[model samples]
Target chain A: TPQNITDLCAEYHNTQIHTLNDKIFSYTESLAGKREMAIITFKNGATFQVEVPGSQHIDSQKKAIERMKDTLRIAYLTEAKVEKLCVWNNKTPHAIAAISMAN
Target chain B: TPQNITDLCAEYHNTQIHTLNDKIFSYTESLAGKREMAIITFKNGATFQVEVPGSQHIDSQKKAIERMKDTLRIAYLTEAKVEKLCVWNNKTPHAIAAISMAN
Candidate 1:
């Protein structure tokens, strides 16, 4: 059972990481007060969402995005073009829809 | 600003990784037919939710969890116990509440 657990986990991570390699169609990160948010799109039609609390600086959140980008790169050995990275702290909703241009 | 982006990313990852190291209070991986889901609780009162689409086999999902746990371990230098790892097919809203015994 222990071996199975370890094996299962390894396989899952391998498959998921592979699938994640080239599926990132778009990426974006934004700001709202002390909360930093990001929404990522994949070719398989899944959204990766993240919310970081207690992050107040735009510079810090931007840095966080870069770290996440690096993590993904290190995991999959590929890179994704960051379409938009900006900061906005107002009452209006600051969300960007993933726009894909045919390649 | 170019240097700032890279610096910020490193700082954010450093801070976030430290914060994530020992915060995982509990972890559970479950299944509903082909949908594999997991909910992780942290000591900082945050939750990490993951849903892997098109994962039909229980073995594979179990493997994926192990991979995630391994990733955490490799990234951070510590680990957490996987409280419940199970599978269910019926429509009973199979979810586990993270119950913590005071330590």
Candidate 2:
């Protein structure tokens, strides 16, 4: 499946999770490795980076979130909530670099 | 009308803009003030803060974007493309403060 955008939309509204649910985008998988990276934007206009290795299948949103959860756990951002807000893939041109404009 | 999410999705994919459209979220209107703020997450997991003051009506997404465009122009971030990715209102808890997780 092409990663249901609705699931991420739901999570963004869900209050059960910690923080981090507000800004979650840039869901791109590696071409030569099993690493996945995501970026979250906070209220004060800051950003937290989430990177995870050993990801088997990050071809979809669900799998990508799972990988992020693991990355957050490893990074001690377990309390952070991960939500999918936008799609930033290889075909998306420089989406990630253009977005994170934290003051 | 509510901010057209589809329009933002299209912009994120658009290549004409100079950037900044990749990460745009936190659509909130102040209750006691006329200031609106948004944050974007870049590829390197950084964040760019956008603050617009003197907003007349930020009750809708359309109005909010107009205000932001003005702010970007003032901030000289005119090259940045603005897009709406999520909703962040007083009722939505602390959405903005939680998301921006830049490394």
Candidate 3:
């Protein structure tokens, strides 16, 4: 028998992952009147919500949710491995959750 | 005679899969502070802008977006699959589109 190591690499990732979305959060990248939405969460436990009802595509929404669920699976599993990392992904306005660990 | 069975399955999906976010967009464990922001697009293409001046911590953000990209890869592939699932994983956001399908 022989020992083998392939497809192995070190990466710097912060979260453990719990679910995922099938698209990247995109804003128009404006030079106008802040022509996009930027959802930022601070150190407390507050938030801001904007609506994307107009941008609603049924399929995209479903895909987003599916991405969320699977990504969660990844996050939970990742957390089990890391122990000190957290995870979140917002659809929109922005959906987010944070769980603290005592390990 | 011809027979083969063990583990094999493939299906069609949609939006031809652009990308995916690997986390389930979460908002908050809140009652006030609006608590979130959602990004949306329009059927005709128009958008608005807002900001999250304060809220949660750092780890959540990093995790949120990573989930996105991974989900997107799944999406692009998904659209390639589906009978149709317009997959969206925020991590890999980009459409690989013209369509008359909307539900």
Candidate 4:
């Protein structure tokens, strides 16, 4: 497929996903505002608490953590392809990701 | 700069930004559940109501809208550069965005 930022984002968003916001087990942050941690249990797999280096802002840090669990959940649901790219979208900036469940 | 997915995510995340969660105006959904829209007033610029082609799911639809607003805000805050590429990241998948605040 052609490499495009909007296309990559569309591909990521278009995939069907069923998990919701009730599966998280526990989430915590470092007192010094350095990092955060989360414990997430999958529906059909062992619980995983992947420690992450969170940022200083609490809200953005939590946003990253939520996406982390969602990414893991999406991974469990289907086979995923990992990508890292620098791309352009109509002369504006966008950071995109996906659980593009394809090989 | 190297074009890496995690680095792109981290680069987007590590930028210091002060805008919070109160700048949004009105966010609405399509009647047929195929698309959504948002009106986001920037901290310094004219209010923009960018209509986007939203997906079927309500939650993910909302996520895209919020990112649109946030992306606009980030653009307002800094001079942004956009790019598109295809690469890999340690066999794990990531979808990333940043108000990276750099040129």
Candidate 5:
């Protein structure tokens, strides 16, 4: 399947899984590989780097959320904080980054 | 309009304007203002924080791209760096954040 864009539209909405394990990141490409990506900032003064994949599918989105869904999930760990957000245009799941924390 | 997620799939694809003036930061909430958000870390070491909004629409997406478009746009400014990215489903236009740099 080329991946039904419409189906993705509906599926992504009700996706309940927020926090996940690194092992669950099957579809997303490993951040270990250097790729051309972008950074995202939020209304708050915190920042995180992200690796935007070419296609926005469940694979990528899952990875992105998995990487970023921690700070709030873990209450900002002592030395293991997220620093990147791999976001996409809603086509599919994307991957975010979390190498280290910034100032 | 409930906001057709499909339309956003195409609209976001052809978006041209990457750089923008802070005046355009109207849609996105100010990072200076505190809010509950998350950070994204790419496969790389870089990271960016993002505010996952309630609704994914044009209002938020524009804000995210404009804020992070830099760094990759201006090649990194002085103190103004994107710290977060507000991402949403393929519904309308969601916002991302850009507060500060992460590790």
Candidate 6:
């Protein structure tokens, strides 16, 4: 399926959840395995590296937000300090990183 | 006139001319007023603080881009190292910020 630019727009805005919502002082676009990602850093030295759905797939903004919401729920539930989230932009979630843990 | 979401989308894309075009290592969203802006920094500490047209007025992506192109032209002509640009969004050209050395 062709990519919908609408979802990408929403993803760009929603992905800024940390900086836009003030969860952190700042963030910068970074990389995670050849994909453009973001590294959000806090004053306490904790950071979460996240990759959004790239333009190679078909997805909805609703789905993207849900994936992010679920990840946040889990991270908060586990009090996760450091982690990497691979969003469900492309067929499946590859959160195979983080391998994710923290108390 | 209502703000055009289409133009905003392109502006959001065009505004990343630096980072996307690799003119710098990276950038972080910053502030230019009571508004959200971006700061593009270089290796030697030189930086450009840029602000985009907000969602208050009517504009087209073509016009928005032409304004940016004109601004870049002026900056390049003068080798402007330190400057600020005011764009044509609300029916006025505010090259008042360089008070603008360009655009």
Q: Using Cα atoms with residue i matched to residue i, what is each candidate's TM-score against the true structure? A: 0.24, 0.19, 0.19, 0.22, 0.21, 0.23
Worst 10 residues of 3 chain B by lDDT: B1-10
Worst 10 residues of 2 chain B by lDDT: B26-35
Q: Is candidate 4 or 5 superior in lDDT? A: 4
Q: Estimate the TM-score for candidate 4.
A: 0.22
Tell how far residue A46 is off in model 3, in angstroms. Answer: 6.7
Q: TM-score winner between 3 and 6, please give it.
A: 6
TM-score attained by model 6: 0.23
Q: Where does model 2 sit among the CAPRI classes?
A: incorrect
Docking class of 3: incorrect
Interface DockQ per candidate:
0.02, 0.03, 0.03, 0.02, 0.03, 0.02
Q: Which 10 consecutive residues of model 4 chain B have the lowest summed lDDT?
A: B26-35
Badly placed stretches (over 4 Å) of model 1 are A1-21, A54-66, A69-103, B1-103
CAPRI verdict (incorrect, acceptable, medium, high) for model 5: incorrect
Q: What would the per-residue lDDT of candidate 4 be over residues B1-103, giving only the tens digit for each residue? A: 7465335544533222223333322111111112222232323332234343334226655566457545643443232432321212221221223333332
Q: Per-residue CA lDDT of candidate 3, range A1-103, in tens?
A: 0000000001112322222222222212222453332232332333322222234334334333333334434434333211111232234323322221112
Q: Which parts of model 2 have CA positions greater than 4 angstroms off?
A: A1-17, A20-103, B1-35, B55-64, B67-103
In order, the TM-score of chain B in each prediction is 0.36, 0.23, 0.24, 0.28, 0.23, 0.29
Overall lDDT per candidate, in order of appearance: 0.33, 0.31, 0.25, 0.32, 0.30, 0.32
Over B55-84, each residue of candidate 2 has an lDDT whose tens digit, in order, gives 332556544454443353223222233443
Top model number, lDDT: 1
Per-model interface RMSD values are: 16.2, 16.8, 17.7, 16.7, 14.8, 17.7
Q: Which ranges of candidate 3 are over 4 A from the true structure?
A: A1-57, A80-103, B1-103
What lDDT is obtained when candidate 5 is compared to the true structure? 0.30
TM-score, B chain, candidate 5?
0.23
What are the per-residue Cα lDDT tens digits for candidate 1 across A46-103?
5554335333324324433333433333322333322221212121232221111111
